[PDB]
Amino acid sequence: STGSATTTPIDSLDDAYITPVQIGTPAQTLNLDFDTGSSDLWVFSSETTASEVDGQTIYTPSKSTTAKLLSGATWSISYGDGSSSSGDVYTDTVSVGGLTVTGQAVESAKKVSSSFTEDSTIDGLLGLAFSTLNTVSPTQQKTFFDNAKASLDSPVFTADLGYHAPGTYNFGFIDTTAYTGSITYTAVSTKQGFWEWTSTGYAVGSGTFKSTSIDGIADTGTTLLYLPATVVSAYWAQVSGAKSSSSVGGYVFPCSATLPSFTFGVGSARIVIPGDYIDFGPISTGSSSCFGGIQSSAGIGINIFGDVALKAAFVVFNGATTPTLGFASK
Numbered sequence: 001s002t003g004s005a006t007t008t009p010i011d012s013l014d015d016a017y018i019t020p021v022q023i024g025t026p027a028q029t030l031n032l033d034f035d036t037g038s039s040d041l042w043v044f045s046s047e048t049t050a051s052e053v054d055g056q057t058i059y060t061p062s063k064s065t066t067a068k069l070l071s072g073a074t075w076s077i078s079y080g081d082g083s084s085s086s087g088d089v090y091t092d093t094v095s096v097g098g099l100t101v102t103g104q105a106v107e108s109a110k111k112v113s114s115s116f117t118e119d120s121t122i123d124g125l126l127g128l129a130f131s132t133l134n135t136v137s138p139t140q141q142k143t144f145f146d147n148a149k150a151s152l153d154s155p156v157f158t159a160d161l162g163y164h165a166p167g168t169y170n171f172g173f174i175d176t177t178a179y180t181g182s183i184t185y186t187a188v189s190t191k192q193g194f195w196e197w198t199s200t201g202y203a204v205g206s207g208t209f210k211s212t213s214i215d216g217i218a219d220t221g222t223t224l225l226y227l228p229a230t231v232v233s234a235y236w237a238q239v240s241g242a243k244s245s246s247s248v249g250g251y252v253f254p255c256s257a258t259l260p261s262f263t264f265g266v267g268s269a270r271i272v273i274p275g276d277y278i279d280f281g282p283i284s285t286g287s288s289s290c291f292g293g294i295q296s297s298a299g300i301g302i303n304i305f306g307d308v309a310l311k312a313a314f315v316v317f318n319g320a321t322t323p324t325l326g327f328a329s330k
Contacts, residue, residue, distance in 0.1 A: 001151045002172035003099025007034065007161065010121040013280055014307060015223050017161060018121060019169055022095040023106060024064030030057050030123035034169055035221030036159070036195055036317065037304070039133035039143050040077050041094070042085055042107035043124035052112050055120030061108065067092045075107045075136045080222065080300065085112040089136055094144060099171050101148050105141035125221070128157065128317065133193035145171070145319060155319045159220055160330070161311035163277055179314035179328035184269035188323040195317060197325050200267060204235050205260030209270070216303030218315060218325055224280070225273070226297035226304040235262055235294050242292070248283050251292040255282060262294060264309060266327040273312040
């Protein structure tokens, strides 16, 4: 089997991407944030504290003939940005782009933090990291990909995120028309539960590539590219007027600047992030100061290849017995 679904930016900055997911019988379609940096599929629901719902589409398990309450089970998650949610657990039939999983754990939110309430476009998350990070208690549950894996033609999914445009998540096959040149594959560590890999270095603009190992995670649920302070300083040093602002919370630059590209290494291959991808617009409405899309990971504890990086590539998440990541230009 295979699946193929279009993913769409939630706003003009590509802050996140949403993908329609069918849940239950008859189908209830919710727009979920596919997150390769977490492993819970959770949704706004009929159980979500009413004051914490503001425009989201909710899952109503009592209207689904295939919903089943997982007795006694609970879940509770916190994300890198400090956001959080929690609730109880159903299983139900879940389909993504034509690919159906029966008995998928669908985690129903009782509580969500303010950032989720305030984002009316995101109806929940669909985690695609390894199932060892799943937060269901007392018994951890499997991700959609994990459940689907044995049915798939090939044990893979791919992320093809667009720059200010829709893209695609495919399950079970590699679309050889979706990228240029070849896919370079690189080793993954699952020790922390993430799609963790080691980049072979970087270049700033037309500069010579610096060969240096950069451990980090491929994370579709993070907006920006977070890298060591050394790397990030070398980048913004090439932008006239750029500076790190503690009050704003990172590197800012004059909106009139022409940003250099940023290259990261995948083995002997190279992915080039165009300068425009690194512009996240005015720091506040009407400001001539703009926020940078490459920021320091110091204090996160890990480097994060978020959407800024991933959308410059066609990315293969290979969930074979020994997982790997593939990157191609496109």
